[PDB]
Amino acid sequence: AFELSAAEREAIEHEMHHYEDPRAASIEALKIVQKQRGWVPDGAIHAIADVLGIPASDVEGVATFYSQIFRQPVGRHVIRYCDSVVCHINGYQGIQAALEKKLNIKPGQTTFDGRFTLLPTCCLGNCDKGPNMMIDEDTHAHLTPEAIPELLERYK
Amino acid sequence: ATEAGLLGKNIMGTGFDFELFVHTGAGRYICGEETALINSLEGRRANPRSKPPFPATSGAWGKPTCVNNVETLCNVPAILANGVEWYQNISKSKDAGTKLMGFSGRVKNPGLWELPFGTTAREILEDYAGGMRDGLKFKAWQPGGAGT
Amino acid sequence: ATIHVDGKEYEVNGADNLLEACLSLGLDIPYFCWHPALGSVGACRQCAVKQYQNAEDTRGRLVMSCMTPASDGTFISIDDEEAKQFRESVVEWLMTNHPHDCPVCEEGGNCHLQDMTVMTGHSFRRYRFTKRTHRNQDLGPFISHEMNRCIACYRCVRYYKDYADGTDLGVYGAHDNVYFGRPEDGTLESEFSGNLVEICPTGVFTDKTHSERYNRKWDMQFAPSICQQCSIGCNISPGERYGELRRIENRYNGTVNHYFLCDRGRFGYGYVNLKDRPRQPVQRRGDDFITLNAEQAMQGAADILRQSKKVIGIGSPRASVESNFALRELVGEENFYTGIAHGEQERLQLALKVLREGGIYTPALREIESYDAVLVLGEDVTQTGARVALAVRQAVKGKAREMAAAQKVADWQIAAILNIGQRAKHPLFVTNVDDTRLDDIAAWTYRAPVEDQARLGFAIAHALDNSAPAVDGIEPELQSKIDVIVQALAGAKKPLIISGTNAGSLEVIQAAANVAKALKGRGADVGITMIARSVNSMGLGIMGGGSLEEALTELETGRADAVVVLENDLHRHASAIRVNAALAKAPLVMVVDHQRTAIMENAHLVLSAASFAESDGTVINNEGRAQRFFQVYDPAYYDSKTVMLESWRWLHSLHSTLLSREVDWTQLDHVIDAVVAKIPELAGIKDAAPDATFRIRGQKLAREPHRYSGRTAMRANISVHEPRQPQDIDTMFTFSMEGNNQPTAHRSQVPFAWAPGWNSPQAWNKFQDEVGGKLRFGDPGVRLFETSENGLDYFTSVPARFQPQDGKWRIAPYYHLFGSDELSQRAPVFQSRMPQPYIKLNPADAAKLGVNAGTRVSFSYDGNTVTLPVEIAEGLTAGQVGLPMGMSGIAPVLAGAHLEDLKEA
């Protein structure tokens, strides 16, 4: 069902060259598969385990330990709004309410068209410019609930 | 720095070999704890380790390992370019050198400024952060992040 | 070292942690994540004590006793109020999410979490919010999974992965949703997965085989017994209820199998509860099967035996020493035959000669873990002697232990040791006809036919010692690997040479003996281990006798017209056609057995012998250790018409009826005295266990716990009148609660571990001199022979290399932990776990035959054409064909034999 692409295999092996032990490339191998396919499916655990020479239980433990390695299907874009305390003071709840009322989903859910998945993340290290959001790779700061219906429509 | 000979093999003709990698994380707050950092570096779950042994004797892959913050290593080059006496003669406090300090959260100017140790929190909040915003009364503060 | 616990002065070992030091002193500290065999990690935070800086300190500090060295001049308090409050708080935090499951949980009354909940005195719930829940996984036929009951103590993963080197169990997830299981549903693949049910302090991992016929630990009738499923002789506690064998628990033995069994021994007891077992003596007259009682069975058998001219007896390596000896006395020494084939007997007595005349110390199973280099020659140890493979894994991790000891890291601090010794390990070189389960930790694996394995052993011996015979025709690459092995073995302080009789090759055993002798001549502390085939293979070899072919010849020639077969099916050691013809020729066949075998159709008389659960006896280890097993239950307590006697009792009463025409149901100690009087090599079996007159301050040893229930009800459907308690004249155990099972009683045989406040397998702490050490008054069992003063000579019979000849196919043996051993593969829970019958082929030979993977091929062996589907074996060599030994129809005497007319069916 799952077979690693050639570019994924070369990227994983190149990451394995960087470390004394090949086990140390597990996080980056999972991130490589996730970057190529949106998330890490079930067969990717065994494929990465075979490439790295570690058990599949270790790969699954690493993949389910880290929050940013997705072991369930996500949408085309992952919205990650900050949940922590400075953005709580700066009013992240209005941003979360605006995102929920636009996308008609709860946090942790994906829209019916597969465009967005909404997730609360921890502090994005941008607390002096809060509240903060992270759509796929872009960090959007100084958020207002009125700017959500324009920010979300530039991610097709 | 590698193309300029500052990294790699035979740095500045001294024979010292140093290779610098950038390992991007996958999002856990416990990964910053140094022994859990070492465990995540080794491709494991980021559980911390009991000390002793400290990572200086048995760290990453059982080798001598030193974990330091970004800002400590950024303090190092000024120390070695200007001297010990200069680093000890910029603040009359028991904590030597300068520190990045800053106020955040519903102040006029939330931000980050490099200040000597012994700078009071009031002068940071008023002179640098601009005081609290309009129509807001100061009721509490955390000095050093969410764990203080 | 001097410690002060609650102001009381104690002398401890300074290299221990405070938790194990205090548990060894009899103090109680609650704990979850620590185990004596796994080391200390400091996870559960339960074992907190209060440490003071000196005697004049009152504040103190809460420390973890498992992570704190018990150094000289230590001051701690267990009964400190703040420490007690913290320990109760830890139990409370574990209780917040714990399911309301104790009545419907197989761990109840045997649960360590229950014990530590009560011990901290936490009985009031003030948590009012929701409990987290978990879905369960299917872990196969042996282990049941209930992740709700988990306390995240991490014992399971640390055992299964860092101790047993299993790969398919792990921890997943995060903060409070931490999950312990497989990455997906499926059978747990470790051969030692069954130890999870005792390692797990809660009811997450439970014995599914016990769960089918569940009963609580107080309702169990236990006895100390020896596992019958291979030669390693791990001590077990079988427990019964309502006349059926319910469970096999690990019985602690700090010299043999301390905390762990393999899965074959733990789950292969199901043959004892088979409904087709003989329960009465049955005589075949024409087509009629008359049921007899004991007395008239002996009278009729003695009459027919008296009228016959020659009577021969065929023993078995399944039977105890007493049963084989009683048969040998009934038929005479000259008419007694061991039930194994001639090649098996040759290999067994050669291994015995190496063990008791080779001058090289043979280690116990626990001592195997301390060796510095291992060479396994010809033995599939994981499939034939599995607990030795687990001990070999510990010996391999010894290098990381030494590396961490070099950095002054304490030996209980397991995580630091494993971090220091990352992938470094002691050298392991395994040799087999194919890949083994030890190949993950093996420095090198040699896949070759048994002649080439023997030649590699002979070459290693010659390279170590030039006086050893040389091998001609070694390839340069194989020579380089030989020098790798020789440099590893010569550089070790304690090399260990493992071989055995299961390879089917005498030359492999000879090569192993040559390597051990060469290492001994260089001044090394070399040990040698020989893995036998069955529970009493070494005892049957020590007693000796003719081979099965000689007995069949005596039956076929008509010189013997009566044969008494003891606990032997005769088809695993000879061809079924020849055995059936020889037994049909004999006018009197008497089979004494506890299982329904195929030769009972030809049997004129069948005596319902007892299995190990219903009998007492002595079995000899693969290391020569004589161990007594004790009867668990009386089979006639529930079924009054059951006549299921011990085999030695049957044969002794038959001998008495043959001589003096009166029966004599003897005693076990009389038979043991007869053994030690008649066979001086077996004289050590007298000291294996004390005799039936042994008492603890005048009272016997109790087989069942003090809270054993249902005394006036368990038999009330049969009759409301309570029957007499079954008397035990053979042993020092009583069939009741009216006895002793104190942890401080001066004895070595402990039927089960229980102490007040310790209802779990953690109660074994109270029965040991120090935790994880020996039993307090010595582990049971005695070594029959000491190490010889002088060794053997070198075996100069170096074989030629294997040559694939056309038309003939050398049978390569494949052993399975589930399937090869006879009695355990008769157990019904093993059939799902048993591999399907697959004949293994090289890709080249399969392409030569025009056969793909899965197509069925037919071959004729001894005139019997059988058909099996093909599995392609990459690691096998050409000209060899792989067959699963011990399965249905594939007798283990096929190892090393040749095959003809292999063609697609």
Ligand SMILES: Cc1cc2nc3c(=O)[nH]c(=O)nc-3n(C[C@H](O)[C@H](O)[C@H](O)COP(=O)(O)O)c2cc1C
């Ligand atoms: C839970 C936890 C999280 C931590 N996260 C970080 C971190 O993100 N970055 C960091 O520099 N130190 C972090 N630390 C502190 C480190 O353990 C360590 O003190 C530091 O990284 C290196 O020491 P230094 O201050 O001398 O450079 C964390 C500590 C704990 C207990």
Ligand code: SF4
């Ligand atoms: S694991 Fe122990 S405490 Fe939990 S339900 Fe089972 S018996 Fe009760």
Ligand code: SF4
């Ligand atoms: S499953 Fe059992 S052994 Fe594993 S962490 Fe949970 S309680 Fe401990």
Ligand code: SF4
């Ligand atoms: S290794 Fe052998 S003796 Fe030990 S439990 Fe397994 S089958 Fe029984």
Ligand code: FES
């Ligand atoms: S609290 Fe939101 S960016 Fe730090």
Ligand code: FES
């Ligand atoms: S037993 Fe010491 S912390 Fe678990």
Ligand SMILES: [Ca+2]
């Ligand atoms: Ca008895």
